[PDB]
């Protein structure tokens, strides 16, 4: 996020980091319950990647984080990689996440829910802060 | 790449108004936000865009794509969850 700010540690409990086997963070994701994570289909996740929950400072070694294995990757069949439409993938965890003060789920809307233009919302992540 | 988790508030745009920036690239299963002085960027993809509804944070978008240079004056494009939640529901119910 460019021009964002540091979050209060643990205040976005559903936020997870997708890291490859080398420990490199390449995408974010959100826990919707103890066994499932929602992410973007274009992130190209594989079962060799790891879901990290409860993390704030990726540079700290003293945080009690949960490194979870991925059992299966469910890429939305409607995903169109040419137009990047329907960019959603579901990850089923091999081991359920342990919900706590710093690890919990975000709510999902109803298909008919309305979010008007002009509404201020929030986005979080460990993406570049400067290009 | 920041070690610590970042956050940013930003406004939702209408797809019609978003087409003024991206044209036909904007589909029905996409929702734009930003062009407000902040921007999601590489590494943020797959992450959440949440809006508070009735006291609870709801997943409205999934960071998808945007300006190649993460320009803060251009809106970011997110996967529109309301258009994809039925599939999420079917997938969990069957697995």
């Amino acid at each position: 996020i460019v021009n964002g700010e540091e979050a209060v540690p643990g205040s976005w409990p559903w936020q997870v980091s997708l890291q490859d086997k080398t420990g490199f963070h390449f995408c974010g994701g959100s826990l919707i319950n103890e066994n499932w994570v929602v992410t973007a289909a274009h992130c190209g996740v594989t079962t060799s990647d790891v879901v990290v929950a409860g993390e704030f400072d990726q540079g700290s070694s003293s945080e009690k984080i949960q490194k979870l294995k991925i059992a299966k990757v469910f890429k939305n069949s409607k995903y169109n990689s040419l137009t990047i439409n329907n960019d959603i993938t579901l990850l089923k965890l091999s081991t359920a996440a342990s919900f706590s003060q710093t690890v919990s789920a975000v709510c999902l809307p109803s298909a008919s829910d309305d979010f008007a233009a002009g509404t201020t919302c929030v986005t979080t992540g460990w993406g570049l802060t400067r290009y | 790449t920041p070690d610590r988790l970042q956050q940013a508030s930003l406004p939702l745009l209408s797809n019609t108004n978003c087409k003024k920036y991206w044209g036909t690239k904007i589909k029905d299963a996409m929702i734009c936000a930003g062009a407000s002085g902040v921007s999601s960027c590489m590494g943020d993809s797959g992450g959440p865009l949440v809006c508070k509804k009735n006291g609870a944070w709801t997943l409205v978008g999934i960071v998808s794509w945007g300006s190649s240079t993460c320009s803060t004056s251009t809106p970011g494009v997110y996967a529109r969850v309301t258009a994809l939640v039925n599939w999420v529901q079917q997938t969990l119910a069957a697995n």
Binding site: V8, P9, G10, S11, W12, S100, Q101, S104 | Q7, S9
Partner: peptide, 10 residues
């Protein structure tokens, strides 16, 4: 869902 135990500050 959607209610963090540690409230975010924006």
């Amino acid at each position: 869902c959607g209610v963090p135990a540690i409230q975010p500050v924006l």
